Amino acid sequence: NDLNVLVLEDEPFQRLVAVTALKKVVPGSILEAADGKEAVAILESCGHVDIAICDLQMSGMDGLAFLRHASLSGKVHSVILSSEVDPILRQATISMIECLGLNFLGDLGKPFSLERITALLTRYNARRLPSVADVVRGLDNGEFEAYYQPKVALDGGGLIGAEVLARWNHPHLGVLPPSHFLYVMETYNLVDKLFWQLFSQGLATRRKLAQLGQPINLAFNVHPSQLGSRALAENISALLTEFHLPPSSVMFEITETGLISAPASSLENLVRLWIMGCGLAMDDFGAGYSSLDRLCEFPFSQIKLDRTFVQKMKTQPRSCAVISSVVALAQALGISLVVEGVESDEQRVRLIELGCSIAQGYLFARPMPEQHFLDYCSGS
Amino acid sequence: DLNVLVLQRLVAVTALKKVVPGSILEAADGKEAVAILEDIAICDLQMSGMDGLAFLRHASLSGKVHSVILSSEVDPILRQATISMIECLGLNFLGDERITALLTRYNAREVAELPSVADVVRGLDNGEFEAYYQPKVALDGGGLIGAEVLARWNHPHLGVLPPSHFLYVMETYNLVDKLFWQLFSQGLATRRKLAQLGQPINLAFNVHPSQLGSRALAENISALLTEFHLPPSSVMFEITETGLISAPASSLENLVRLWIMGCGLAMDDFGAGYSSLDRLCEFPFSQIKLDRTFVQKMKTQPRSCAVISSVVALAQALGISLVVEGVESDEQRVRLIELGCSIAQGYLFARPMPEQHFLDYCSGSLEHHHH
Amino acid sequence: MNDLNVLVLEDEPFQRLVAVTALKKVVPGSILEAADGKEAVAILESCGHVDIAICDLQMSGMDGLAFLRHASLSGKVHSVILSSEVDPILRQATISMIECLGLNFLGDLGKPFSLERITALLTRYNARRQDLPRQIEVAELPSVADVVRGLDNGEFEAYYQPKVALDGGGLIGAEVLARWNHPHLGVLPPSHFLYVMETYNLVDKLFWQLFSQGLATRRKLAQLGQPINLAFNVHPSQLGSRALAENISALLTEFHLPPSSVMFEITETGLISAPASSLENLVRLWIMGCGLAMDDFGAGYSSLDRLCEFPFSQIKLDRTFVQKMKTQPRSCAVISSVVALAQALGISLVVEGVESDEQRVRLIELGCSIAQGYLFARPMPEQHFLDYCSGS
Amino acid sequence: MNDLNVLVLEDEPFQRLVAVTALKKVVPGSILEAADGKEAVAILESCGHVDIAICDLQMSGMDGLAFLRHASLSGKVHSVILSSEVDPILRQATISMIECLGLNFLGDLGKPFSLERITALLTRYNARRQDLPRQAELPSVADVVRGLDNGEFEAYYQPKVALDGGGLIGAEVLARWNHPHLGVLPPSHFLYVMETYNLVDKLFWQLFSQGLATRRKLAQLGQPINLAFNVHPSQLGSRALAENISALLTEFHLPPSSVMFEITETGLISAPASSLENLVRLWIMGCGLAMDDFGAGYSSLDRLCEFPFSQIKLDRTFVQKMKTQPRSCAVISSVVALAQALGISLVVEGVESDEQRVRLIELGCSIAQGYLFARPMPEQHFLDYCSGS
Ligand SMILES: [Mg+2]
Ligand SMILES: [Mg+2]
Ligand SMILES: [Mg+2]
Ligand SMILES: [Mg+2]
């Protein structure tokens, strides 16, 4: 009311029947393409397209490449498939449409039953938690921004470094945390993609900080799956070069858990980064069995313990004992320890009493976007 | 007749001008060693070492060094990783006078060893891996229905090698993807010739399970098919039943795109789980294949025959093809025909061949059929 | 949000520890732990509700799925998370199978078990909590103790289900099936006791009670000139005892019965999961001359190869195969392959769960020959069964 | 390339089936399956040689590392393949730890087994078949059963001492076989088997009453040295343990406080809650409790609402690693810090040279065991040792 449908249908009689069925039910314009090249030109100059329709059973490798064109244009919202999808590959097909960053509206067979074209229109406008399609589009569209949380010294004011955190400017929900997209990115293998957007932003921020005479070390989280990648280390350097920042300006964090399930060849990237001089933190330390055995076998330059140690100090003396033990450990290996989630002064002094040097939490600073951080940094 | 580059820099070099008979070059950094071109590179790898990590890197794709002694005895804790890191560049790793001990080791370096990681990375980089082709044939008559594309290494000293001598390496070092694209385009080229000889014959490529998780496998396959002006159905992709079991969660995206494109999809080593019949049901493979042990155990085991029968019925009821592997003799060829099998691979027809042998096999076979 | 309730089923103490440690950090509420069926059913019995069960679908020490089935009958469980992110092709089928139990599928946990991922699944749960069916403590799921006393008070009766030819309904044999004459709940099928008996090693006790009620009946049939063989289910655990085959033979002799008058049935999963030492009893029953049937068949072929000679005279197709015929027609191809298999081995095929005549005709069309199900005859107590066995 | 014997250890029957199915297609030889230890050991005894053991170090109903240790001593096993690619950082330690047993490590299998990866490991095996071995009389199951049924096991005692001085604090009670033919044997030659055939408990009640006889002597003498007895996880099962321990202490006129129980970290981790209730019961009774073999990490601390341990003991390997693995010194430091902050004692084991006695002092360690001070002794020697002090 009024919609804008684009049908891709090669076979001319089929085209004829389809479009004619669409006139009856579809309030609004309708466009027509006899192949990929003609459809990609209807795109090359048109506004929004509410629904794209094409036939994946009949063709085939054209239909797929089209949908990508549909995807790349940024101009299409939803998809109806003009053949019935096989029950056994239903979810496969939907998921495939959604990794294009298109919404799957539905499917139906030629010649179209008119009641079925209504069902899907009603359903469509009825769409007026984020979906897979949403995440992919958000990512293909530079909506993801880097946030910054400082690692400060507990005693004094301090400013030692920062953890780069992923946030998403949602056009309707606003700023969101990883739990609302990492699932999707994790499941569909977009983590790498997000990583490189953020790593670039992060280095740009690192430059502005070097321009300002600030030794703020920027720490990035690396997903274990990336650790298996052939050229991660070689790509991190190429960018560190392109940006004229030195290795040591920068640090990569990997959880203890994720390090457990990491791919056979993870070490090839890890020796790289270590030699290079990049700092390497083992994050959420104390999560597996052999935590102490791990530090032994890999020269991590930092250890981080998480929100729960701090919270548990007061009510649970065993936490204090392990905080102290860890302090000793970092102390004896000559590396840094960051204690996360400090929210109160009580907590802060206790940590000092125990021996901890670095912290993060809402006491000092919540995660911040580039500018608020830069301002924060101009001040210590 | 012996080359040394190295990169206190004077202690080892007078200790070298006392040892190595030949041409001794030298440089202070990457840039100056990269110019020092116009056999052995000794290396300090607590250079820490991005400069310590520019050097070896041109060196490797330059084809300008073969072997690497480090100028430092690194911390045993990441000695393995560091060795993997060298070798992964395609450079051989000798070690850390113990000095002269390894310089005559490899100036000399007979039942000889399995290839090193470095060996395999090199061969991969220097076009030494070649597609071979084994025909799928109509048991009744003499094919020719298709061909499987296999990987062999034209190793410079050892001759032709089967995957046992390189695939572990590539799997552990995430190099299988790189081999696949090499052999895939080789196979597409052969498929052109095959059309050009009037023999449209489907070619099947084995896909490694890890590859199915890769973001744009199917689309690349798609682009490449367009480049070679070949239709999707001239090509097939085979994945082992167990491989599919261990496959990444994203795998179905690639499989559905291939199916939708119209390439064939074969489930290879059918029956190796655990859920075999259930799995066939949930995905529409156009072909399943039996391991060669099924045909071998046909004399001893009435059971082997039974499962062949069962699978023959399974494929005919799904309207898909069945390939039986391991056909080594004529008596097992006729037994297979009683059982209702139709397509086969095996030594009786042809072991895997390099392109030209395969083409000549094809010509001959066509000529035989026409009489 | 509140006292979330999470039960983790994990066999392997180091995975359990990793998982539990991660859950403690992030889950608001209690984390419960089970290493085996016994802990798991105990935890279930004492709990009022279990909001999320985290389950590993292949364990050595526990059948995860069987616990889920039992759990679904309890009323107490909202949702399931799987800790094996396995098998892409079979993933939908695995989901639906969970969903047909009553259960809600939340997602899979990775074998990392990343804290971020965990909170996603919790937010996800928490957004569904209301829309989910109420948790009630169903009193119809007899407790372990309660099962244990029934089994000590002679209230388990043998029922008999005929196996018949598909064209006609001519009698061929029958399976003996366990029913519980529950003092106050009525007559219960295996859904209501078998899983408990399996988990507390009480199956062997049930088998000896039913096996002799059955031989009694087989004796009466012989006397009637009715050559109907009776088939008894042997659970894999029972194969544990080196003397099973010898105990079975002493008992057959005691009842004046030849081995050929009887058959034993083991599931495919059971046969697969048994140590070779244990598989030696089947070889023995086979040599004695008993029939042997491999039960709930249909999954693949690798069970054919466990033993030097295939000891089985019969194969039975899993009940679900008839239901899937319309629902998923590719399953007709498996029925065909299994028909072809049985014929090639020269053994018989039974197809179970035949309820309508439209199924009967299709099964005949596929080449099936012997069948069990509601369409022909319900499980009967002895006298109804005996009377049924007068009509040819 | 033929007549191999391959042993597959696999807990989980579908995984075992897949592996065995793959193995039969490709191995020229025999494929032997073991679903547990009871089966692994039996296959071991009948076998005479096993070319390759395929083994999962992370199983539920079988300890894969234990079995490999036992196989290593039998000298019947050449190579190992691991059925998991687990843990890239800890991989080199794992390989070394295996090679230190005297087994050649071949590689990992992807734990749904590929055919071409099997024949690869096969070609690797063949290449390495004639390599130089390494390192010894292993008694059989039958032998252990009769040995045990015939009172051949004796209690030995190892003092726990102050690292400076040599002051006596306590003693661990140890097991030794007084074997009719091959002499005095340590647990390396019997415990694994007892562990896997449900015989440990029987060994325990013998040595416990032997140890009680010795404590009671010490107590009549007014020499209060607590004796620590190792408890195996399986025994935590029987809910009667503590009643039975309490009843013996009574029979011997001793209080709970005179005695201590030791349990390994991995033992503690492997245990159902139903079992840890038993540990608590001993602690409520007033027995001492130690966690043996400590130092992997911190996860053990959080299994019970109350930590029931008064003592923590590091493994021999730590003293040993001090040189060839300097980083481990940090962990000792760390454990010292832990133990101290917890207000419990820390025992370091396997101290040989006074050189390494000095470093432990630096690091902060106080209590110890090892050959520097006193080697395990039979009753009477130990009774005299104590008399000195
Ligand atoms: Mg982090
Ligand atoms: Mg193949
Ligand atoms: Mg049955
Ligand atoms: Mg001890």
Asked whether the beta carbons of D59 and D42 are under 8 A apart, the reply is: no
Stated as kind and residue range, the H or E segment containing A370 is: helix A370-377
Strands D77-82 and C348-352: unpaired
Q: Per DSSP, what are the bridge partners of residue A151?
A: A161
Among the partner residues D86, D269, D334, nearest to A325 by beta-carbon distance: D334
Is C2 annotated for ligand binding? no
Place of tokens 């495939």: A96
CA distance A57 to D105: 51
Cβ–Cβ gap A183/C22 under 8 Å: no
What residues in chain A have their Cβ under 8 A from chain B's Cβ atoms? 56-57, 60-61, 63-65, 68, 86, 88-89, 91-93, 95-96, 99, 187-189, 228-230, 234, 237, 247, 263-265, 267-268, 270-272, 274-277, 296-299
Q: Which residues have C-beta within 8 Å of that of residue C279, sequence separation ≥ 6?
A: C239, C271, C306, C307
CB A285 within 8 A of CB A253: no
**How far, in Å, CA of D196 to CA of D37, rounded?**
6
Q: Are D227 and D196 in contact (CB under 8 A)?
A: no
Pairing mode, strands C171-182 and D311-314: unpaired
| Ligand closest to CA C292 | 3
CA distance A178 to A155: 31
CB contact under 8 A, C299 and B311: no
Which of A163, A183, A291, A315 to probe by mutation at the C interface, max C CB count within 10 Å? Answer: A183
| Residue C38 near residue C200 (C-beta atoms within 8 A) | yes
User: Residue A285 to residues A305, A333, D330: CA-CA distances in angstroms?
Assistant: 5, 15, 16
CATH of D137-389, one of 3.30.230.30, 3.30.70.120, 3.20.20.450, 3.40.50.1000: 3.20.20.450
Q: How many CB atoms lie within 10 A of CB D63?
A: 21
| CATH fold for domain B111-371 | TIM Barrel (3.20.20)
Q: In what order do the strands lie in the sheet with A28-33?
A: A28-33, A3-8, A49-54, A76-81, A103-107
Return the residue of D nearest to B294 by Cα: D25
Q: DSSP secondary structure string, D191-206? A: HHHHHHTT-HHHHHHH
**Three-class DSSP category at A279:** strand
Tokens at A305, concatenated? 């313990």
**Which secondary-structure segment (H or E) carries D88?**
none
Query: Cβ contact (<8 Å) for B256 and A86?
Result: no
Q: Among the options B38, B110, B325, B367, which is catalytic? A: B325
Q: Which of B74, B208, B260, B280 is the mutation pick for testing A, counting most A CBs within 10 A?
A: B260
Give Cβ neighbours of residue D150 (< 8 Å, ≥ 6 apart): none
Closest ligand to residue C315's CA: 3
Fold of B1-110: Rossmann fold (3.40.50)
- For residue B158, the CA-to-ligand 2 centroid distance in Å is 25
Q: According to DSSP H, which parts of B50-104 are helical?
A: 55-62, 79-87, 98-103
> Rounded to the nearest whole angstrom, what is the distance from the C-alpha of residue C160 to the centroid of ligand 3?
11
Is the peptide bond preceding residue A111 cis, with omega within 30 degrees of 0?
yes
Q: Which of B44, B72, B85, B167 to mutate to test the interface with A (most CBs of A within 10 A)?
A: B85
User: Residue B76 — φ and ψ, nearest 5°?
Assistant: -35, -25
| Residue B19 and residue B101 in contact, taking contact as beta carbons nearer than 8 Å | no
Is A256 marked as binding a ligand? no
**Could you give phi then psi for residue C80, rounded to 5 degrees?**
-125, 140
State the sign of the Cα–Cα–Cα–Cα dihedral D164, D169, D175, D180. positive
Domain D1-136 belongs to what topology? Rossmann fold (3.40.50)
Show the tokens assigned to B268. 């290879």
Classify residue D166 as left (phi > 0), alpha (psi -120 to 50) or beta. left
User: CB–CB of B39/B66 below 8 Å?
Assistant: yes
Distance C42 CA to ligand 3 centre (A): 28
**H/E run at residue A369:** strand A368-369
Rounded CA-CA distance C78/C135 in Å is 7
Q: How far away is chain C from the Cα of D228, in angstroms, using its nearest Cα?
A: 26
Mapping DSSP onto H, E and C, the string for chain C reads: CCCEEEEEECCCHHHHHHHHHHHHHHCCEEEEEECCHHHHHHHHHHCCCEEEEEECCCCCCCCHHHHHHHHHHHCCEEEEEECCCCCHHHHHHHHHHHHCCCCEEEEECCCCCCHHHHHHHHHHHHHHCCCCCCCCCCCCCCCHHHHHHHCCCCCEEEEEEEEEECCCCCEEEEEEEEEEEECCCEEECHHHCHHHHHHCCCHHHHHHHHHHHHHHHHHHHHHCCCCCEEEEECCHHHHHCCCHHHHHHHHHHHCCCCHHHEEEEEEHHHHHCCCHHHHHHHHHHHHHCCEEEEEEECCCCHHHHCCCCCCCCEEEECCHHHHHHHHCCCHHHHHHHHHHHHHHHCCEEEEECCCCHHHHHHHHHHCCCEEECCCCCCCECHHHHHHHCCCC
Distance from CA of C86 to the nearest CA of A (A): 13
| The pair of three-digit structure tokens given for residue B253, joined into one six-digit string | 């995206």
How far away, in angstroms, is B235 Cα from ligand 2 center?
Answer: 13
Domain residue extents for chain C: 1-136, 137-392
What's the rounded Cα separation, in Å, for the pair A280 and A283? 9
Q: Pick the residue from chain B with its C-alpha nearest to A241.
A: B50
Q: What is the DSSP string of D110-123?
A: PSS--HHHHHHHHH
- Which residue type occupies C43? I
Q: Which of D296, D307, D337 sits opposite A293 (nearest CB)?
A: D296
User: Ligand 2 (ion): which residues have CB within 5 A?
Assistant: B 206, 238, 268
Strand-pair category, B146-155 with B129-138: antiparallel
d(CA A114, CA C261): 64
- Calculate how far, in angstroms, residue A361's C-alpha sits from the geometric centre of ligand 1: 12
Closest CA to D191 of D280, D67, D34: D67
User: Distance, CA D292 to ligand 4 centroid (Å)?
Assistant: 5
- In what helix (H) or strand (E) does residue A318 lie, and over which residues does it extend? helix A317-333
CA distance B293 to B326: 7
Q: What are the two backbone dihedrals, phi and then psi, of residue C158, each rounded to the nearest 5 degrees? A: -75, 135
Which residue shows structure tokens 């973001």? B215
Would you say domain C137-392 falls under CATH 3.40.640.10?
A: no
Cβ-Cβ contacts under 8 Å, A270 against chain B: 78, 81
Residue entry with tokens 């990992």? D108
Q: At B73, is the secondary structure helix, strand, or coil?
A: coil
Tell which residue, B307, B281, B312, has the closest CA to residue B294: B307
Is residue C141 a contact partner of residue C134, using CB atoms and an 8 Å limit? no
Q: Among B110, B114, B212, pick the best mutation site for testing chain D contact (most D Cβ within 10 A).
A: B114
Q: Is A346 annotated as a binding residue?
A: no
Q: Identify the three-state secondary structure at position B68.
A: strand
Query: Do the Cβ atoms of A305 and A359 come closer than 8 Å?
Result: no
A1-128: in CATH 2.60.40.10: no
Using CA atoms, how far apart are residues C148 and D267, in angstroms rounded to an integer? 32
Q: Which two tokens stand for residue C218?
A: 């087989």
CA torsion sign for A38, A44, A45, A51 is positive
Q: Are A217 and A251 in contact (CB under 8 A)?
A: yes
Q: Cα angle at D25 between D19 and D28, to 5 degrees? A: 105
d(CA C301, CA D254): 63
Residue C255's Cβ-count burial label (10 Å; 0-12, 13-18, 19+) is: middle
Residues of C in contact with A224 (CB under 8 A): 112
Residue D108 in tokens: 């990992």
Q: Which residues lie across from D160 on neighbouring strands?
A: D170
Q: On the CB side of A226, how many CA atoms lie within 13 Å of its CA? A: 22
Query: What is the distance between the alpha carbons of residues A299 and A279, in angstroms, rounded to a whole number?
Result: 10
Residue B131 neighbours by CB under 8 Å, 6+ apart = B149, B150, B151, B152, B183, B186, B187, B190, B354, B355
Cβ pair B68, B42 in contact under 8 A: yes
Tallying the residues shown for chain A, one arrives at 380
Q: Say if CB C349 and CB C338 are below 8 A apart.
A: yes
Angle made by CA atoms B81, B86, B90, in degrees to the nearest 5: 130
The helix/strand/coil state of D100 is coil
All residues of chain D having their beta carbon less than 8 Å from the beta carbon of residue B273 are 14, 18
Cα of D172 from ligand 4 centre, angstroms: 7
d(CA D148, CA A324): 46
State yes or no: is C45 an active-site residue: no
- Which has the closest alpha carbon to C359: C388, C331, C392, C389? C331
Tell me how far apart the alpha carbons of residues B201 and A258 are, in angstroms, rounded to a whole number.
46
Please state how this structure was obtained: X-ray
Phi, psi of D306 (to 5 degrees): -120, 135
Chains with 3 or more CB pairs closer than 8 angstroms to C?
A, B, D
Per CATH, the homologous superfamily of domain A129-380 is: EAL domain (3.20.20.450)
In angstroms, rounded to a whole number, what is the distance separating the alpha carbons of residues C342 and C338?
A: 6
Task: Report resolution (Å) to 1 decimal.
Answer: 2.5
Phi, psi of A376 (to 5 degrees): -50, -45
Our CA angle for A208, A211, A212, nearest 5°, is 90
Contacts of residues B84-87 at CB distance under 8 Å and 24 or more positions apart, as own/partner, are: B84/A265, B84/A267, B84/A268, B84/A271, B84/B117, B84/B173, B85/A268, B85/A271, B85/A272, B86/B56, B86/B118, B87/B116, B87/B117, B87/B118, B87/B121
- Which stretches of chain B are DSSP H helices? 11-14, 30-35, 55-62, 79-87, 98-103, 105-108, 117-125, 167-172, 176-196, 217-227, 241-245, 251-261, 276-282, 293-296, 302-317, 330-339, 355-369
Distance of alpha carbon B140 from alpha carbon B343, whole angstroms: 8
Task: Answer for the pair B160, B153: CB distance below 8 angstroms, yes or no.
Answer: yes
User: Quick one: C12 exposed, middle or buried, by C-beta within 10 A (0-12, 13-18, 19+)?
Assistant: buried
Structure-token pair, residue B98: 């113990």
Chains that touch D (3 or more CB pairs under 8 A): A, B, C
Residues 6+ apart with CB under 8 A from C118: C22, C23, C26, C27, C109
Which chain A positions have a beta carbon within 8 Å of C107's beta carbon?
183
- CB distance A288–D299 less than 8 Å? yes
Maximum separation of any 2 CA atoms in chain B, in Å: 79
Which of B80, B171, B274 is opposite residue D14, by nearest beta carbon?
B274
Map residue D6 onto helix, strand or coil: strand
- Measured from the alpha carbon of residue C266, the closest ligand is 3
Which ligand places an atom closest to the C-alpha of D116? 2
What SS3 class is residue B96?
coil
A257 within 8 A of C113, measured Cβ to Cβ: yes
Q: Looking at the partner chain, which of C87, C328, C336 has a beta carbon nearest the beta carbon of B314?
A: C336
Query: Could you tell me the two tokens for D314?
Result: 């590091």
Phi, psi at residue B187, to the nearest 5°? Answer: -70, -35
Question: What tokens were used for C235?
Answer: 């659970």
Angle between helices B217-227 and A61-73 (to 10 degrees): 110
Cα separation values, C43 from C55, C66, C76, D343, Å:
14, 15, 11, 34
DSSP string, A104-159: EEEE-PSSPPHHHHHHHHHHHHT-----HHHHHHHHTTT-EEEEEEEEEESSSS--
Is the CA virtual torsion A245, A248, A251, A252 positive or negative?
positive
Q: Which chains touch A (3 or more CB pairs under 8 A)?
A: B, C, D
CA distance D294 to chain A (A): 11
Residue B108's φ and ψ, nearest 5 degrees, are -105, -40
Q: What are phi and psi of D21, to 5 degrees?
A: -60, -45
Beta bridge partners of A282: A254, A303
Gyration radius (Cα) of chain D, Å: 22
